[PDB]
From a paper:
In a subsequent round of mutation screening based on crystal structures (see below), we identified four additional substitutions of conserved surface-exposed residues of VIN3VEL that strongly attenuated (R541H, R556D, L563D) or blocked ([name]) polymerization. As expected, the head mutations L563D, R541H, and T559E and the tail mutation [name] all reduce or abolish self-association without affecting the protein expression levels. VIN3VEL crystals also show protofilaments; however, these are invariably composed of dimers rather than monomers as in VEL1VEL. Interestingly, these dimers result from mutual domain swapping of H4 between individual VIN3VEL monomers whereby molecule A donates its H4 to molecule B in an adjacent VIN3VEL filament, and vice versa.
The Arabidopsis [name] proteins are accessory proteins that interact with PRC2 to nucleate and propagate silencing at the FLOWERING LOCUS C (FLC) locus, enabling early flowering in spring. The [name] domain adopts a compact globular fold, consisting of four α-helices in a quasi-antiparallel “up-down-up-down” configuration, each of which contributes to the hydrophobic core, as illustrated by VEL1VEL. Mutations blocking polymerization of this [name] domain prevent Polycomb silencing at FLC.
Residue numbers in the entry:
A (entry chain CCC): 532 to 601
B (entry chain AAA): 532 to 603
The structure:
Amino acid sequence: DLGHIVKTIRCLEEEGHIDKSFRERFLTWYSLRATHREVRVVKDFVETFMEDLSSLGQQLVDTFSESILS
Amino acid sequence: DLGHIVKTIRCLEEEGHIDKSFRERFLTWYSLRATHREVRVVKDFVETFMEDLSSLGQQLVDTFSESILSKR
């Protein structure tokens, strides 16, 4: 998920909620120094975010489909 | 709200849930044919996601600032 983690942090930062300095320090730390437990914990965060993000995708697709097909 | 919708769709794009066509197709509908209710529904879903991102933002910062900063 080393690509997935970049895409999550990027996503958070792109929409506000995280600043540039934190994103680049986070990704340096994640890639070089985070311990196996610390990588598990971040993986939970990204999984929560992936399920949040997918839910919203289905809402928007379903909203759009319902408006067109009705 | 529009900027939140566009940047959200990007976040959907990069993870590949959504097909390529959806962005232009959804934005054209959202901006040009969505009823007052459909527009409200779209903003409300996107605010509920923004609130998930804000909470997740703070939880990432609070949980890991020490481990990140301590190693310089």
